Amino acid sequence: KLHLRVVTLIEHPFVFTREVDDEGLCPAGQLCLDPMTNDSSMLDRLFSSLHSSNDTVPIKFKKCCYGYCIDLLEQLAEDMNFDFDLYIVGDGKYGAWKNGHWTGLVGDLLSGTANMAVTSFSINTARSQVIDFTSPFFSTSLGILVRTRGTELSGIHDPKLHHPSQGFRFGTVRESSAEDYVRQSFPEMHEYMRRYNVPATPDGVQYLKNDPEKLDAFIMDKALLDYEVSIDADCKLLTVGKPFAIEGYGIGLPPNSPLTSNISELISQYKSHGFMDVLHDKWYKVV
């Protein structure tokens, strides 16, 4: 039996957190730590304590994780006979090349701080050069979130984005594959967006959705934006434009991991037996 330390990132509906219950446990979820660290020794010490007599892990670090990716993780752990420790990435980023190093999930895999990364993690060319990804368990275009009767956009080639009018505010999430895409493909658009980019998806959505409005459009994975539109009561939100920058989501592992092919095989079995349909309908609230 293997023991894997898994890093995740909170991104609805793939991973959510809530507080531990009145007895300190996680009835319908997975106990995880939110310790805000990228230090491997610190995580060893915390998890060691968690699993021992005399658990002295500071209560503020304890959370319950749940979501599409946690259901998937649980199934993998059962089929592949491993147990796992689960923690939330300290910088809250998916990961990019910044100041001579990889940040976020990518960084924790490359430093050996995590054994595997499980969340809405995009498989792109730059990351594929440095970490392993399994076969994808989900696929998504990038998308553009706007208000109903607000900004209209044809897609990523809209002149509104490339010769923006003064005060036209649009952004994406920092250190993500969406940012990588814009940086690589539309360098001058990237430069314009820098002042508008946000730390995390919920910030971009709030800035578009809530008053006083802070973004006119928010660029991010359509699977995530679609989820936000679907839970919007008011019906004030739309995703607009042609698809672009389509990427799979996959589980990240260190490069040339002997685990990758085994996990990919199970992901393929799960897809071809309806399990991804089951998870999609549960978590996007179909039916």
From Swiss-Prot:
<feature type="binding site">
    <location>
        <position position="122"/>
    </location>
    <ligand>
        <name>D-serine</name>
    </ligand>
</feature>
<protein>
    <recommendedName>
        <fullName>Glutamate receptor ionotropic, NMDA 3A</fullName>
    </recommendedName>
</protein>
<feature type="topological domain" description="Extracellular">
    <location>
        <begin position="152"/>
        <end position="287"/>
    </location>
</feature>
<feature type="binding site">
    <location>
        <position position="177"/>
    </location>
    <ligand>
        <name>glycine</name>
    </ligand>
</feature>
<comment type="function">
    <text>Component of a non-conventional N-methyl-D-aspartate (NMDA) receptors (NMDARs) that function as heterotetrameric, ligand-gated cation channels with low calcium permeability and low voltage-dependent block by Mg(2+). During the development of neural circuits, participates in the synaptic refinement period, restricting spine maturation and growth. Forms glutamatergic receptor complexes with GluN1 and GluN2 subunits which are activated by glycine binding to the GluN1 and GluN3 subunits and L-glutamate binding to GluN2 subunits.</text>
</comment>
<feature type="glycosylation site" description="N-linked (GlcNAc...) asparagine">
    <location>
        <position position="38"/>
    </location>
</feature>
<feature type="glycosylation site" description="N-linked (GlcNAc...) asparagine">
    <location>
        <position position="262"/>
    </location>
</feature>
<feature type="binding site">
    <location>
        <position position="178"/>
    </location>
    <ligand>
        <name>D-serine</name>
    </ligand>
</feature>
<comment type="subunit">
    <text>Heterotetramer. Forms heterotetrameric channels composed of two GluN1/zeta subunits (GRIN1), and two identical GluN3 subunits (GRIN3A or GRIN3B) (in vitro). Can also form heterotetrameric channels that contain at least two GluN1 subunits and at least a combination of one GluN2 and one GluN3 subunits (in vitro). Does not form functional homomeric channels. Found in a complex with GRIN1, GRIN2A or GRIN2B and PPP2CB. Probably interacts with PPP2CB. No complex with PPP2CB is detected when NMDARs are stimulated by NMDA.</text>
</comment>
<feature type="binding site">
    <location>
        <position position="120"/>
    </location>
    <ligand>
        <name>glycine</name>
    </ligand>
</feature>
<feature type="binding site">
    <location>
        <position position="221"/>
    </location>
    <ligand>
        <name>D-serine</name>
    </ligand>
</feature>
<feature type="binding site">
    <location>
        <position position="127"/>
    </location>
    <ligand>
        <name>glycine</name>
    </ligand>
</feature>
<feature type="glycosylation site" description="N-linked (GlcNAc...) asparagine">
    <location>
        <position position="54"/>
    </location>
</feature>
<feature type="disulfide bond">
    <location>
        <begin position="32"/>
        <end position="65"/>
    </location>
</feature>
<feature type="binding site">
    <location>
        <position position="177"/>
    </location>
    <ligand>
        <name>D-serine</name>
    </ligand>
</feature>
<feature type="disulfide bond">
    <location>
        <begin position="26"/>
        <end position="64"/>
    </location>
</feature>
<comment type="similarity">
    <text>Belongs to the glutamate-gated ion channel (TC 1.A.10.1) family. NR3A/GRIN3A subfamily.</text>
</comment>
<feature type="binding site">
    <location>
        <position position="127"/>
    </location>
    <ligand>
        <name>D-serine</name>
    </ligand>
</feature>
<feature type="binding site">
    <location>
        <position position="221"/>
    </location>
    <ligand>
        <name>glycine</name>
    </ligand>
</feature>
<feature type="binding site">
    <location>
        <position position="122"/>
    </location>
    <ligand>
        <name>glycine</name>
    </ligand>
</feature>
